[PDB]
Every structure is written in structure tokens, then in C-alpha cells.
């Protein structure tokens with residue numbers, strides 16, 4: 001019930017790697033950002049990436065880290081950014097994590113548009129995002145290759161007047 | 166009507182720069198790829214880019230350069246690419262021939278699975294021309310491009326390999 005975001009650091013790398021146990025789960029979580037297996041050299045490159053904020057999700061009651069989230073593609077010209085790398089490591093927590101990052105994107109960074117992508121079979125996550133204000137814009141058909149098949153990605157967004165009004 | 170694509174080269178740079186006469190037209194044509202004014206250094210970086218093909222469109226009968234088109238974001242992992250930097254100087258028919266030529270490269274030469282194309286929502290004639298040759302609207306990316314004090318909406322469109330061979 002009480003979560004906060006903190007900066008994701010080297011000491012949090014191993015926990016994240018242990019949560020990402022398959023190539024398909026890696027892709028569901030992060031798309032084209034990484035190769036399987038996830039490892040510390042890739043995570044170092046991730047946190048050092050320009051225009052990317054990496055966060056661990058902390059349960060304030062226990063101090064345990066229970067997930068991960070990122071605000072990336074921070075674009076100061078178009079005033080936009082993309083939420084991604086959404087992970088609820090321990091068994092809505094997702095809603096609280098999204099609200100915390102939306103506060104950063106809209107209220108601290110003063111952005112105009114925040115995007116998100118979710119693969120179409122993750123209907124529970126899509127419903128949760130729609131409940132807090134994300135809107136489906138379009139389904140990017142067979143846009144991610146996974147082995148010999150292709151996944152469809154729902155491109156979703158929220159504009160500043162949907163958050164602030 | 167006999168059109169061909171040729172590699173866009175240094176000798177074609179000045180003509181393209183003179184055609185892109187305003188920041189708004191630069192954005193309509195190329196989105197976030199460049200800064201205004203368009204210049205030689207930026208075009209050189211463009212043609213030397215990894216995973217990018219730059220073409221001038223030539224009328225075979227006269228040798229006149231009548232447009233520009235690019236196949237970029239060539240992604241060998243997801244087997245996809247994006248058509249962009251579409252410039253047509255007859256326009257509807259030339260645009261259709263230019264798209265077919267680049268789709269031949271993407272699907273028949275490069276063996277890709279998916280080709281995307283973005284067009285700002287006020288270019289209703291171009292969107293209708295793209296739909297006529299098989300492109301499908303996927304979604305409208307709301308207020309995704311800042312232009313001065315306002316935002317433009319982009320129609321994200323696509324064609325899959327089995328739509329090309331239909």
C-alpha cells in the first residue's frame with residue numbers, strides 16, 4: 001500500500017537479473033533494450049544511458065525492493081517520454097508505480113506526452129493502465145520478432161491535460 | 166509514367182536543401198531527423214547512416230529529379246523498416262510509384278516482415294493515397310511532434326509482408 005521510487009544502482013542489479021528468468025519474459029519486460037541473459041554490464045550501460053531514468057520500487061513499510069520501472073526516451077524538444085521496463089517483482093502495486101513515474105514526467109519534468117507499450121496478450125496490465133488514464137492509440141502489428149513468431153504491441157499514451165485536468 | 170529510384174548523392178544535396186524552405190516543411194518531410202536549416206553536413210551524415218537508404222526519385226524520360234524517399238530504421242532483428250523523408254514534386258501517381266519501388270526493396274530484396282510509415286494527420290490526401298496501395302492505419306500518435314507552440318498528431322501506418330504479396 002505504501003511504495004516509493006528510488007534510483008536503481010549497482011547493488012540492485014543482481015535482484016533484477018534473478019527476476020528476469022527467460023528470454024520471452026525479458027522481451028515482455030523490456031522489448032529490444034537488452035539481450036538474454038540480462039547481466040550487470042548491460043544494466044550499467046542502461047543506467048548510464050542519456051535521457052533515461054531507472055528506478056527500483058521500494059515498499060516503505062519494510063524497505064524491501066519489490067519491482068522496477070523506468071522513464072526513458074526523455075525528449076526535451078517534443079516534451080515527451082516513455083514509461084517502460086515495468087516489473088512487479090513481488091506478486092495495485094503497478095498502479096502506484098505508474099502514478100509515481102507520471103508525477104515525475106508531468107509534475108517535475110513538465111512533459112506534454114508520456115507513452116507506453118504493452119504486448120497485446122498482457123490484457124490485465126493493459127486494463128490496469130487504462131484504469132489510471134492511459135489511452136490505447138494503436139496496435140503495432142507483428143512489430144517484435146520472438147524466435148520464429150511476431151508479437152503485437154499496444155502503443156498507449158497520456159497527455160498532460162489528462163493527468164493535470 | 167516512368168520513374169526510377171537512384172542513390173541520393175552529394176551532387177543532389179543543393180536541390181534538396183532549396184526544396185526544404187522552412188522549418189515546418191522540414192518537419193512535415195522528415196520529423197525529428199534534422200535541424201533547420203537543412204545543410205551539407207547533415208545530408209552527408211544521413212547518407213552515411215547505418216541502416217538507412219537515401220533515394221532521389223528520377224523521371225527516366227527526362228532525367229529530372231522529381232522527389233526524394235528513404236527506407237530507414239532497417240532492423241534485422243525484428244525484420245522491419247520505416248519509409249520516410251517522402252517528397253513528391255502527377256503527385257498522387259508519382260507517390261504511388263515511389264512507394265512501390267521502396268516496398269520492392271524492403272520486402273523483395275531485404276526480405277523484411279513489416280514496413281512502417283508516419284504521416285501527419287493534416288496530410289489527408291497522402292494518407293488516402295497510402296491506403297489505396299495497401300498501407301493500414303494502426304494509430305494516431307497524439308500531439309507527438311512539437312512545432313513552435315503547438316503539437317502535431319502522427320498517423321502511424323504499416324504494411325506486412327503478406328499484404329504486399331496479396
Ligand SMILES: [Zn+2]
Nearest residue numbers: 103104107108
Ligand atoms: Zn515531485
Ligand SMILES: [Zn+2]
Nearest residue numbers: 269270273274
Ligand atoms: Zn529488386
